[PDB]
Amino acid sequence: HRIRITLTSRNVKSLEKVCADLIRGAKEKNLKVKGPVRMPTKTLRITTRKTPCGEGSKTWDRFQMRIHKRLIDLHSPSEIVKQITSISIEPGVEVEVTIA
Amino acid sequence: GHQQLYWSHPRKFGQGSRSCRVCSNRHGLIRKYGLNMCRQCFRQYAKDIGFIKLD
């Protein structure tokens, strides 16, 4: 009865496509669900050298890889969580949940 | 024994134990985020893995 959605996705508005369907898709059965909590973003920072060998002006890469985390708590019996989360997915979002 | 002598070197640590998981050379290795990947092959598959130049 105390359930917790783990929304971890790489693309930004791909995570919007799921975190819109976890309110608009859930309120149709009348459950007072919690709101999507903005967890802070994580920029995985890599600076490699552009050059394969070691000749040229020291020109560095800056390969940022942003990750975006949300959580939505659920006032739900977990039978209904197997219904909503098994429907309407895209590969961008990894669909995970903390149970109790 | 030759079995005793042919692989007598510990590979518990050092920069000759781990290698590039594409090249199998022991240089420019990204140990960060468990990549085990040489800086050139990382640069090749950066777009493919998920990394991208923005800054």
Binding site: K42, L44, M65 | Y33, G34, D48, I49, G50
Partner: peptide, 19 residues
């Protein structure tokens, strides 16, 4: 997972599966 790898190793090590 039991050994329970992090979400900084999820998008990187499952990123290697795309490669």
């Amino acid at each position: 997972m039991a050994v329970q790898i992090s979400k900084k190793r999820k998008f990187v090590a499952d990123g290697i599966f795309k490669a």
